[PDB]
Each structure stands twice: as C-alpha cells, then as structure tokens.
Design a protein around this ligand. Structure first.
Ligand SMILES: CN[C@@H](C)C(=O)N[C@@H]1C=CC[C@H]2SC(C)(C)[C@@H](C(=O)Nc3cc(C)nn3-c3ccccc3)N2C1=O
Ligand SMILES: [Zn+2]
Length: 90
C-alpha cells in the first residue's frame, strides 16, 4: 500500500500547493497528478505512495519524468504510467 494513504486523493494533493513558489515553472496540477504533494517548505514535494522526496525543481521539469528518474520502483507510478514509460526514461 501507499506510504501516506491520506494523500491518495489528487484533489487533496493539489490543495496542498496553495503557496507553491513555482506555479508557472512547474504546475501544481501536474505535480499533484504525478502523486506529489507540497510539504510547505521551499519547493520540496513528496509522493504519497513511495514517499520519495524531490526538491530543486527547474523550470519545465516534468513531474512524471522526474518521478520515473528517481523512483522507478514506485507502484503508483507503475500503475499510472506503465512499465514501458518508466523503461524509456531510463
Ligand atoms: C532538476 N529536477 C529536480 C526535481 C531534481 O532532479 N531533484 C533533485 C536532484 C538531486 C538529488 C535527488 S536525490 C533524491 C531523489 C532523494 C532527491 C533529494 O535530494 N531529496 C532530498 C534530500 C534531502 C536531504 N531531503 N530531500 C527531500 C526533498 C523533498 C522532500 C523531502 C525531502 N533529489 C532531488 O530532489
Ligand atoms: Zn512515488
């Protein structure tokens, strides 16, 4: 199961970005779609399922791509995007 079941709702994850510092550079809609919620600190986010933490976001970073780069074992990512997608990013 998920590391943090309470952030399994996409709606709740998106709500967590109300004070995201990088709205234009990396959209909260995309981050939340990709399983991430804002911690509230700087630009640190975390996946509800694998608990993986990503910070230091650059403009145009794609949340799903970064999810697969760093946490390719995540089952939420596998379920959502498929193995071929993860394989191609590596
Ligand atoms: C350029 N695009 C960025 C999204 C990126 O590649 N991210 C970092 C690239 C350098 C190192 C990797 S290792 C990592 C997957 C664990 C992650 C990272 O450095 N995370 C981290 C380290 C520490 C001491 N805390 N956190 C962290 C980040 C976010 C939430 C909670 C904890 N990380 C990154 O977040
Ligand atoms: Zn994950």
């Amino acid at each position: 199961g998920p590391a943090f079941p309470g952030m399994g709702s996409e709606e709740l994850r998106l709500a967590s970005f109300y004070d995201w510092p990088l709205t234009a550079e990396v959209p909260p809609e995309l981050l939340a779609a990709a399983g991430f919620f804002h911690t509230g600190h700087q630009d640190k986010v975390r996946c509800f399922f694998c608990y993986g933490g990503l910070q230091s976001w650059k403009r145009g970073d794609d949340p799903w791509t970064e999810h697969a780069k760093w946490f390719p074992g995540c089952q939420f990512l596998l379920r959502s995007k498929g193995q071929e997608y993860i394989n191609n990013i590596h």
